Design a protein around this ligand. Structure first.
Ligand SMILES: CCCCCCCCCCCC(=O)OC[C@H](COP(=O)(O)OCC[N+](C)(C)C)OC(=O)CCCCCCCCCCC
Ligand SMILES: CCCCCCCCCCCC(=O)OC[C@H](COP(=O)(O)OCC[N+](C)(C)C)OC(=O)CCCCCCCCCCC
Ligand SMILES: CCCCCCCCCCCC(=O)OC[C@H](COP(=O)(O)OCC[N+](C)(C)C)OC(=O)CCCCCCCCCCC
Ligand SMILES: CCCCCCCCCCCC(=O)OC[C@H](COP(=O)(O)OCC[N+](C)(C)C)OC(=O)CCCCCCCCCCC
Ligand SMILES: CCCCCCCCCCCC(=O)OC[C@H](COP(=O)(O)OCC[N+](C)(C)C)OC(=O)CCCCCCCCCCC
Ligand SMILES: [Cl-]
Ligand SMILES: [Cl-]
Ligand SMILES: [Cl-]
Ligand SMILES: [Cl-]
Ligand SMILES: [Cl-]
Ligand code: NA
Lengths: 311, 311, 311, 311, 311
């Protein structure tokens, strides 16, 4: 077979629709997610038109190999989609209604800047290449774009699944390609990060500050150094859940800044001891007493500045 | 081929049955499990009827492509099932008995709220989309729903495998869909959590409380800080076995609450030392003496409140 | 192509044989192992019989699609076997000799109770479902059950590969089913556990006991608490190599019991200090002196009791 | 079918082109990356020629099986490429234009010497082996070599995608082989290594140096030994992201050198204590005072020497 | 199809050749490696003989299904080989030249005894089973055995790729089997183990020995216990890269022996303190002074003995 010929000189319009059945495996490091959906296609092929009466039937059913089917492909899939044709219907005027069901691993970049309070726009790009006989163009049938209410993405809130109606028409290797952008809007469920990372990380930091109510160098060194090690453990744990970004993430910035606090705390603890040994506890006591206020204050201020820069 | 035509204007009833042979790989993080089972289908196709007394055979055997087979699909599978047709039998009155063996990776959400004392209802959804000639409707043949006695799910107790007999009939993209809910009821074997997580976690906590029978700041700091680090290790280990939830889990709450105990123990240890240095050991001794009782008591009470809120 | 019909009222006997070529990937957590073997099948089909003198051959060779082949399946495989037909031979009296080669991931439960001094019986279950014309029954041709001398299972000693000759005949969904049990007997190579887990674990424990020859609370706290943390590391490491069992494993019991020793050691260390501060070193010295003997003795006794309960 | 026979005694020229659609999964340990691209092929087959006037068509379209297609393979792919034929176009003079969409996992060695400030040249090798009738030779059609502007490789900057126009023609197992080198030039986004590994590693080192302003052996031992352990954690973490190389990597050298600093710091801390106990604090104070300068200075000098040797 | 019949009573000789294109993924724990190569086969089938003149061509080209091809299989592959036929050539006398290209995951045992200074002989076993008509025998065509110059195996040096020319002919399940042994000789690049495991491990050990120049029990306990924990971390890290062996590995022995040194060091540190408290520093000083020499000496001697037993 070959493509439906033009009546007048017009491009062939392939109407499309994606209906999400399942969404799973949003992998932050790989920047991929897996989808399981219906793909619907619709186009006019006049060669397939018929008389309702001489057949006695309102619609005709075909097998894929029997008719011409436009070669619709996904741009951003890892390995080309697993596809099962569900139904092919032809109406009297030769309007074809194709329905497949597929599953794919979609590669879509994520913006980690506000992690874990980030929102993402995942994209599924539909595409078609024009042939020599005629030019093919994609369109969105809004009636056939949706998601079943059971669709869930573990650790995320699904906001919407919509399509940008106007295709992106452009030339690639001397042929026209018509590209569609289906968008899945999601936002991260930051809840668990509070009792699992943020709060534990703040507790160990506050514990380090008890060194400001102690004159025991040996105890202070144990406090500050031990808590610093627990901070390293959380830092390492966090970096395991994320890809390496060429920018600072919100959490990443908080985590980095905290190292500076531990470093300055070690200096204070060192200075206090040095002064104590040099028989000048009064200077030492001033620095420690200032530290009790300066540390929580500078910490609270730096965090406000950061939240501001990031949100 | 095409679907069996109606006598009167009835929808076509496809009787279904799932018989579990193997169940494995319950993955808590992915919220999936793998199943290996028989899928049986039964429907009436009059065009296939024949005579027993004369045809020489009480039953006729067909190959999949020889007859019409309803396109039954699973809703919540990750990749569309691996399927091997075992047998196709036709009775004289045109009743078809289809039997396949399949294996699938099923996506079903889990409720972690009571982890590790949780129970789950795993779902396997059967579905069929109606065609233009006729409407297809699913039904459960209870005689063909079961599981072999040997079915085990590592780390879980299998309660039952049953089907909700009433299909969910609804319209999707202007066609009828008929959906069935097969349910696998399981409950977690919490045993191992006791010697592996809970008890070790309580031991390290109780060890931190020995600081209440010591006046040595340097020793107390080592006790409380060291045990806190071991607590972090268990917290980290626990979060590895679970997905991130938008709610607190039972274990998660116990784990979080314990951080508060360590934090307050550091304050007490700090207060006691401060008073000792300020030449007021009698105040310090009162606080420590109260702590010996207040800590186990408030801990035991807080745990009762939590068990109540969660169970 | 239907099954061979009976002479008299007999079921069809399918003779089977499994010959292990390769054995690999015994996964303790998944409770699976992978096999690569020959599967031989043999049955009588009269329709295929011929005269040696007329045909000019004493053996006829067929392609799978040309003749009837019984549908033999494995019960406990994860995904239905990867199969390659090697040869099909027919003798003049119509005896068929089928030979395939396959590889499968077999799910077989393991008894962890005596880990790492455990032995296991892995099972490979062959099965056949009876058809409407005749009943199919499995049998073992002992001549065709074996394993090549080179078969190895990393971290295990291969004892035997045998079959239970008497099939388990039972009814499933109103049809006869004939099941065979091929058994692969293996025993764990416990060697590496001695220098890698057991001995290091005992060393750190004995190191904790040096606290019984010290009056330094600050040092004792460091000794006992540090070694307890290293014990936690080994406990965590061990639980990574094993699935969660609803029973105590040998190693698991030793590991759990050791926590009690650390706990009691912390109490002793605490009691000794308390007495020392209260100006009663003589009482403290008695308790420490008893501890030097009580600890190794109670440890050695408890281990004898455990080894007895488990072996 | 067989290859187009030669007019004169010429080898057959297959023009090639690779156009990157997606690039992902650069795995440093496996030394592999995944690509998703267009592969275009073009060659002269006279047997396919036709008259443009007599035909009325400007172009003829064929299915893969209908004509001879050169067997183009990739040298350095892990598993044989997933390939979907998009279009086959033949012009009046018999010039075929083949276009497929493929995805492959490419094995290409990486030079870790300057990690994480390294740049890499990834290679994709196209190959064709000559047939008995004629010799096949590859060529690059520069018009059909490129990458879509959206191409990204997580944690890397994509510099260029070009082909070495000139094929490597050589003999292998007595037939000619024509090989093409497509090159993807990338450079690592070293940014994240600064707040995640380098700076934390320097902080803990500087913390160890506070021991040079302390006369407390017990405190100094805690400082130096604790920070050394955190250094080990970073070393271990780094080696997880890299394969084992028969050469030192930049980071690897910095990491190794730092161990020497910790070792020498322990010696200094030991020497200082020894002298203090022997009632010679003046000697001890000289060594400590020199250490305060010698350590940062020797560290800064050694790093300059290293950066020089590596860059 | 059936095999070519014998002229006299000879067995059919299938000439073989393996030419390595790529080698990757040497997995020490699984004891597997992945290969990507050419498999060439040659035999003669007189039934395929043709007259160049009557046929037009000097050489004939067939598709696999058109002629008889010997069923060559690999013994030690995990999943039965991914294979694509490149060319089938028949010359006038009926000499067939088969060429495929394949990729496989090969299971070959490794000898870890000298790890990481070990060398290995990896095996690829080709096999063929005889049929009833005639006996098939394998042979090596040395002209078709090799590896491309670019073949690399990450973390290993490739020594040679050769075949044992003499097949192993034997009987299995009443038929003849002809087996060939292709050998890939490799040796481990031990370099990285020196700065990453060995040296760091020695540094921490030497750090523990500084306790022999200190009279501070509290400091000595911190030194020895802390370094022992870092030793455990390296031990654990090492055991991750290796399967569990029923024998001691070189590294494994060094690692185990070091535990004894830590243990004895703790005893010395304990003895020294005990004597100090009992008002006998002179005895304590003798033991410490001997320790300073005995420890490095016994360590250096024990390592020579080990190096001797293993090399
Ligand atoms: C450690 C330091 C404190 C860290 C907490 C930062 C939270 C934050 O700042 O995150 C902010 C986000 C919501 O922001 P948004 O939805 O992006 O709004 C963007 C709209 N603007 C740009 C117009 C403003 O989180 C939350 O609603 C819940 C925060 C609970 C934090 C509990 C601790
Ligand atoms: C330290 C804090 C203590 C933690 C212990 C929590 C156990 C618990 O309290 O959980 C209770 C669960 C059983 O509850 P269920 O089967 O879900 O019943 C739900 C039915 N309702 C809805 C009517 C309530 O476990 C057990 O059978 C007992 C295990 C003993 C735990 C030993 C420690
Ligand atoms: C910490 C305490 C030490 C733990 C060691 C327990 C080992 C054990 O006692 O386990 C027993 C196993 C053998 O088990 P079996 O072959 O099933 O014999 C059961 C036979 N009955 C039922 C008749 C009694 O030991 C060994 O072959 C060697 C163990 C070397 C241990 C070195 C440390
Ligand atoms: C720990 C001690 C610090 C180590 C930092 C060394 C980085 C370096 O020195 O590397 C420099 C590289 C650039 O190298 P290039 O692009 O390959 O230039 C090759 C040109 N030649 C061949 C002439 C030399 O990165 C940078 O410009 C930014 C480095 C910021 C590091 C901040 C910390
Ligand atoms: C703790 C002590 C450190 C252990 C170092 C043992 C190295 C060794 O002794 O190993 C020796 C192997 C080479 O062995 P081969 O090539 O297999 O020789 C087998 C042939 N014979 C048996 C006939 C001799 O490595 C080396 O080239 C030396 C590496 C030096 C690393 C130093 C740090
Ligand atoms: Cl696609
Ligand atoms: Cl499905
Ligand atoms: Cl099977
Ligand atoms: Cl390829
Ligand atoms: Cl094979
Ligand atoms: Na300490």
């Amino acid at each position: 077979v070959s493509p439906p010929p033009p009546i007048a000189d017009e491009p062939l319009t392939v109407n499309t629709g994606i209906y999400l059945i399942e969404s799973y495996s949003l992998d932050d490091c790989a920047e991929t997610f897996k989808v399981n959906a219906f793909l619907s296609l619709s186009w006019k092929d006049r060669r397939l038109a018929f008389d309702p009466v001489r057949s006695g039937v309102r619609v005709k059913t075909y097998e894929p190999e029997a008719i011409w089917i436009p070669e619709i492909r996904f741009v951003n899939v890892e390995n080309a989609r697993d596809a099962d044709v569900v139904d092919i219907s032809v109406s009297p005027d030769g309007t074809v209604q194709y329905l497949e069901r597929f599953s794919a691993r979609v590669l879509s970049p994520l913006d980690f800047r506000r992690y874990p309070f980030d929102s993402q726009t995942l994209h599924i790009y539909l595409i078609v290449r024009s042939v020599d006989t005629r030019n093919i163009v994609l369109a969105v049938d809004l009636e056939k774009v949706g998601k079943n209410d059971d669709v869930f993405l573990t650790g995320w809130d699904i906001e919407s699944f919509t399509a940008v109606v106007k295709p992106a028409n452009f030339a690639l290797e001397d042929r026209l390609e018509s590209k569609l952008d289906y968008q899945l809007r999601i936002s991260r469920q930051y809840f668990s990060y509070i009792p699992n990372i943020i709060l534990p990380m703040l507790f160990i930091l506050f514990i380090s500050w008890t060194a400001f109510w102690s004159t025991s160098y040996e105890a202070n060194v144990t406090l500050v150094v031990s808590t610093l090690i627990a901070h390293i453990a959380f830092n390492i744990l966090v970096e395991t859940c994320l890809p390496k970004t060429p920018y600072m993430t919100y959490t990443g910035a908080i985590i980095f800044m905290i190292y500076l606090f531990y470093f300055v705390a070690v200096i204070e603890v060192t200075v206090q001891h040095y002064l104590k040994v040099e028989s000048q506890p009064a200077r030492a006591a001033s620095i420690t007493r200032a530290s009790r206020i300066a540390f929580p204050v500078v910490f609270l201020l730096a965090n406000i500045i950061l939240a501001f820069l990031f949100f």
